[PDB]
Amino acid sequence: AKKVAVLAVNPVNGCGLFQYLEAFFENGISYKVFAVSDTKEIKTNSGMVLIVDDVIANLKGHEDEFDALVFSCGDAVPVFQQYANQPYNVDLMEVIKTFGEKGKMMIGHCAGAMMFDFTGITKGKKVAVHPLAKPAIQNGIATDEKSEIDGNFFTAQDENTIWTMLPKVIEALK
Amino acid sequence: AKKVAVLAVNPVNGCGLFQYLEAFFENGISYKVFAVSDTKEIKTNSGMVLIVDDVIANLKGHEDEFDALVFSCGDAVPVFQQYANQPYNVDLMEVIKTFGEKGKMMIGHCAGAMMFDFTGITKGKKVAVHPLAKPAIQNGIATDEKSEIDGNFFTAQDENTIWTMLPKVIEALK
Numbered sequence: 001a002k003k004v005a006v007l008a009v010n011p012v013n014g015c016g017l018f019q020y021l022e023a024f025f026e027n028g029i030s031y032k033v034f035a036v037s038d039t040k041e042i043k044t045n046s047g048m049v050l051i052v053d054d055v056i057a058n059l060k061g062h063e064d065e066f067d068a069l070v071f072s073c074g075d076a077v078p079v080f081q082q083y084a085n086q087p088y089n090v091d092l093m094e095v096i097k098t099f100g101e102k103g104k105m106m107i108g109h110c111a112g113a114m115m116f117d118f119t120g121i122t123k124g125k126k127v128a129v130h131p132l133a134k135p136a137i138q139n140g141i142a143t144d145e146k147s148e149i150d151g152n153f154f155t156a157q158d159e160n161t162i163w164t165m166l167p168k169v170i171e172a173l174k
Numbered sequence: 175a176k177k178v179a180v181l182a183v184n185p186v187n188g189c190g191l192f193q194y195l196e197a198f199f200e201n202g203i204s205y206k207v208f209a210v211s212d213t214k215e216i217k218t219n220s221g222m223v224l225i226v227d228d229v230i231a232n233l234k235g236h237e238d239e240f241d242a243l244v245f246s247c248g249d250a251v252p253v254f255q256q257y258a259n260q261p262y263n264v265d266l267m268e269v270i271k272t273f274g275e276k277g278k279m280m281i282g283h284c285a286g287a288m289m290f291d292f293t294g295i296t297k298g299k300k301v302a303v304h305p306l307a308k309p310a311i312q313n314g315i316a317t318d319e320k321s322e323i324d325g326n327f328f329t330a331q332d333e334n335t336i337w338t339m340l341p342k343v344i345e346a347l348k
């Protein structure tokens with residue numbers, strides 16, 4: 001019964017986030033949602049209070065217990081580099097790197113491929129990424145497609161193109 | 175300009191909800207989210223917790239303050255009928271009737287058209303509705319279409335067909 005660690009940044013795009021969670025719940029895939037935050041209480045881009053399962057600090061060292069990582073992008077991302085030293089963002093890099101190195105399935109949209117890329121795990125792999133974050137892809141092969149599936153990477157250009165890969169994401173977890 | 179009252183049942187389908195909220199937010203359309211519940215704190219079908227703006231009881235008497243109602247469906251709706259002693263479900267019927275009677279734009283998906291139908295406001299209008307809820311449509315005219323726009327009614331069969339009518343909804347609310 002497959003298990004996914006869903007990473008929700010703060011603020012998270014709720015439309016992206018619930019596309020994933022709704023598809024997992026409807027298809028009987030297990031998930032736990034970790035805030036990329038000090039607290040499990042976060043906000044959506046649109047300002048709604050959202051309380052998820054746990055915080056990313058508590059995912060570290062437990063990466064083994066999951067089959068897949070979802071990076072659910074949001075308005076936190078454009079300020080990531082500015083706040084790279086925040087503990088939740090140091091944990092973010094380590095966890096993405098660990099999942100990547102352990103061969104887990106890596107799922108993301110908008111700037112998710114960029115977060116993956118920063119850790120080097122995307123080396124030589126086709127990724128779809130927000131057209132704005134395309135210049136920051138240094139290790140992966142950034143394309144202009146709505147989504148790219150390559151090896152362990154499942155990435156969509158943004159929330160409005162998650163649909164183009166989601167049936168395949170679900171099938172790979174079922 | 176235009177103001178939308180969004181009704182979130184408990185549990186709500188978060189994929190449906192945020193498709194609306196992201197679209198409104200990104201197009202600068204004003205909205206306020208009301209829990210169809212005894213408190214502002216609701217769950218998603220997927221088990222996340224949302225704290226919304228207010229409860230539906232506080233929308234009673236203020237329907238003319240809004241231009242549009244969104245009914246955001248969830249796994250609460252198929253138990254709606256069992257739960258006649260929840261005051262917020264009685265309030266729901268009241269609020270939907272009042273909005274429809276006052277000629278407001280009525281927007282919803284999945285079993286939303288059925289909630290509308292129960293109040294009678296759908297008399298003679300085409301609606302899109304989830305297949306399982308279709309036989310419950312007696313006042314309106316249920317179709318097999320992905321979405322239906324008829325008069326003041328903008329309804330989608332479910333969360334995965336919202337995209338088919340959402341640009342028209344946005345255009346109408348500008």
Ligand SMILES: [Ca+2]
Binds near residue numbers: 046192195
């Ligand atoms: Ca949002």
Ligand SMILES: [Ca+2]
Binds near residue numbers: 189218221
């Ligand atoms: Ca949900």
Ligand SMILES: [Zn+2]
Binds near residue numbers: 074075077109
């Ligand atoms: Zn993003």
Ligand SMILES: [Zn+2]
Binds near residue numbers: 247248
């Ligand atoms: Zn429903």
